[PDB]
Symmetry: C2
Subunit: 176 residues, 2 copies
């Protein structure tokens, strides 16, 4: 598996092995962020496994990953939903297409990404991959936003940035 | 290190090795919890290190631990603040002396404790011990209480139980005043 390196503009210039790519000096690459709701309109929040190289054990939005060469974002979302959560989803829809960020985790591991954000509904039960997810919670989008707004440090920095973007919060809010 | 064992009552029965004590069954033993506030009245929230046997990588109140043989709970509090946080504190105040809690952690480690809770002010800068604490934040208590209300699952369960005890919460509130 790989990440796609991106030049100044977001042109793909090459690839790196996924694990080797995330260091204290992580270079800009392509990724996605996804927010999953069930038929009832509850938001899935997940906790990353303690073995994740970047932000292990951190509570975050439903699913995140790295599109591979030639893979659409939508497909990468579908792929990681199946891989991390064994869950089928409706066609992902765009909720924050220009999201980009750089952050440093507590051990100094950096994420540095162009990271369009999506939402979708699950259409099957979860089946948890414990190599990726150590815990999760179905909740009210309203309570999660209240938590993000009160103690954003309790959550991943990108979850926070996405949830506090005016328009993205609007589009997520209509998912209930 | 070890832990002090208590019977079905809160009466000491003996001691047990620390690590060895905390497993998927763990016997009742003595512990402490403390909530630390800086001069400004901000609350120190900390994140347990990934290597912690129990609740690794979990956000929680400032410090918790186990008094050792011959030690007073307050001395225990003082020692762990120094060990984990490198920080000096004012005499710890008892804010929830009867708090008890049994709980299973995400990987099945059980904590079964008599755990009096304290509050104190820090009197020195922090020197975080990365073997024990992987992240920390100075925050407004009000904010922390809002997050705990909104997403309680995002924090250690003992942090939440203590925070929602009315009497404990009022003592936490008293420590938000600015002091010089
Ligand atoms: Mg992922
Ligand atoms: Mg401790
Ligand atoms: Mn990445
Ligand atoms: Mn214990």
């Amino acid at each position: 598996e790989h990440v796609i390196l991106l030049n100044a503009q977001g042109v793909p210039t090459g690839t790196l092995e996924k694990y080797a790519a995330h260091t204290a000096d992580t270079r800009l690459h392509l990724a996605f962020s996804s927010w999953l709701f069930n038929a009832k309109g509850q938001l899935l929040v997940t906790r990353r496994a303690l073995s994740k190289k970047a932000w292990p054990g951190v509570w975050t939005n439903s699913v995140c990953g790295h599109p591979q060469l030639g893979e659409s974002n939508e497909d990468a979302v579908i792929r990681r939903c199946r891989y991390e959560l064994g869950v089928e989803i409706t066609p992902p829809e765009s909720i924050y297409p220009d999201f980009r960020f750089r952050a440093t985790d507590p051990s100094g591991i950096v994420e540095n990404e162009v990271c369009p954000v999506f939402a979708a509904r699950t259409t099957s039960a979860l089946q948890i991959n414990d190599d990726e997810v150590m815990d999760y919670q179905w909740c009210d989008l309203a309570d999660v936003l209240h938590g993000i707004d009160a103690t954003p440090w309790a959550f991943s920095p990108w979850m926070v940035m996405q949830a506090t973007n005016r328009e993205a919060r609007k589009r997520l809010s209509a998912f209930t």
